[PDB]
Structure 1
């Protein structure tokens, strides 16, 4: 349904889609609620996004961060974008990792279980 690098995400796991971005649940979160926010348009590097895709990528990231920090009971969030091969980018598509954080906080999901974290998450988005 949704394009992410050279993988096709099923909407079942996509919990937000805006005018220019989309958000998905992780097949292997680093921590609970580890979600990703990407631009719909498939570009590998951050300097490739027109300015609007940027305002829309990060406005959406603000929103999502708040939801997962709430739903997953964290008290802080970590945002991180590995921009390019020497920075960690495996899948070649701009993407921000949003991880909720817990006091002294510090794998493989089933298409249906991820499908469950997704529906849970859609609820906070009006």
Structure 2
């Protein structure tokens, strides 16, 4: 019951939801712990978000980053927002990729492995 571009995201793979944003696990993680933080409102471009959505998207991103860097044993984090088509945006919904980074660094999984990861992550926001 979360929109992401034109896909409906099952709650089981969503591990955080605030008043204006939500975070989900990826079907295709680039690295372990690769997660996405999106505003609840589906806007395509970042300039479309209102000031309060911007504050919340990034305060949630901060919280999510801390959790995934801990949980997936990274020693750093990469945050990247591909804003727009010439920037790599495939799904047209503003979102931040958060990736746990570690020294010197398919991986496709099931809806159930996704849901198990999300459940693990939910424990850090209790």
TM-score range, shorter chain: over 0.9
Which structure 1 segments of 5+ residues have no match?
A: none
Shift >2 Å, 4+ stretches:
none
Question: Displacement of 1:42 after TM fit?
Answer: 0.3
Deviations 1:28-71 (A, max 9, x none): 10000000000000000000000000000000000000000000
Which structure 2 segments of 5+ residues have no match?
A: none
Q: TM-score, normalized by length of structure 2?
A: 0.98
Match of 2:63 in 1: 63
Question: Displacement of 1:107 after TM fit?
Answer: 2.9
Question: Displacement of 1:106 after TM fit?
Answer: 16
- The change in CA–CA distance for 1:106 and 1:116 in structure 2 (over 3 A counts) is closer
Whole-Å separation in 2 of the counterparts to 1:123 and 1:92: 30
RMSD of aligned C-alpha atoms?
1.5
